[PDB]
Amino acid sequence: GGPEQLRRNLARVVGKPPADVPDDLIRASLASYARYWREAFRLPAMDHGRLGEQLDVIDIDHLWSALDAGRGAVLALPHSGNWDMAGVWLVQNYGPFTTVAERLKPESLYRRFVEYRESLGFEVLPLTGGERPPFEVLAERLTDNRPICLMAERDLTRSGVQVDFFGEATRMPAGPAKLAIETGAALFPVHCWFEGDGWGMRVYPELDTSSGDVTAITQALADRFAANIATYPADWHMLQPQWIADLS
Ligand SMILES: CCCCCCCCCCCCCCCC(=O)O
């Protein structure tokens, strides 16, 4: 990917040709992208207790009430803001939670990322090469009334769910919907962004899972993801291709 790509993606968000995306927006998005990596470097060494105390989550009671009901919960969020910081907040305010991560190449790099996230207090299951299938483990967490977190706006594989996203076709992962259907767990959209020199985080009302249609649910997730991103366009650092048309 790159920043030329990032321009093509922001173009969808604001409904303008790539050339007309406001310069101020591109700068802030690039600044935001840099900030994530800058924070990732030092995050493991910060005072996690302090961060948990000083950062807030809007409408966190949504999550708490699902957990009071014994239902478990799926936190689905886009690549906006600093999701790693949100994870630290949850470890401190709730406890360890489970997630999954793509097994990058090289293997030395995958382990590095695992060590990183493990040092933040997450359980990260490999999508491949683990003892068991990841989405069985996730389901057990949900059935024990625990939260899992999933990055949920990108999955450009055969198995990704085809959805409309800012008026154009993309594919998103099916996991959040599958798990909610399977476990009865609440499916909460989440958004993270940068609010000045700090971090914004919000939980939104759980999604309607009545249809039992993985497609309708995932599309409803996208509709929300799209709305929030339209609200915080600069905080969504997507440098890789997102929409199908931008692919090989
Ligand atoms: C109520 C707000 C709390 C939300 C907590 C979200 C924590 C997410 C942790 C993500 C860990 C790994 C995902 C990154 C992998 C990737 O998509 O490149």
Numbering used by the authors: 48 to 295
Q: What did the published study say regarding this structure?
A:
PatA catalyses an essential step in the biosynthesis of PIMs in M. tuberculosis. Our results reveal that the enzyme has an α/β architecture and shares with other important eukaryotic/prokaryotic acyltransferases an acid/base catalytic mechanism involving conserved histidine and aspartic/glutamic acid residues.
Strikingly, one molecule of palmitic acid was unambiguously identified in the difference electron density maps of PatA–C16-1, PatA–C16-2 and PatA–C16-3 crystal structures. We believe that acyl molecule is associated to the enzyme due to the hydrolysis of palmitoyl–CoA during the isolation and purification of PatA from M. smegmatis mc2155. Interestingly, the comparison of the three crystal structures revealed conformational flexibility in the carboxylate moiety of the palmitate, located in close proximity with the lateral chain of H126. It is worth noting that when the individual palmitate molecules observed in the three crystal structures of palmitoyl–PatA were superimposed, they showed important structural flexibility at the carboxylate region, suggesting that the carboxylate group is not in a catalytically competent position in the crystal structures.
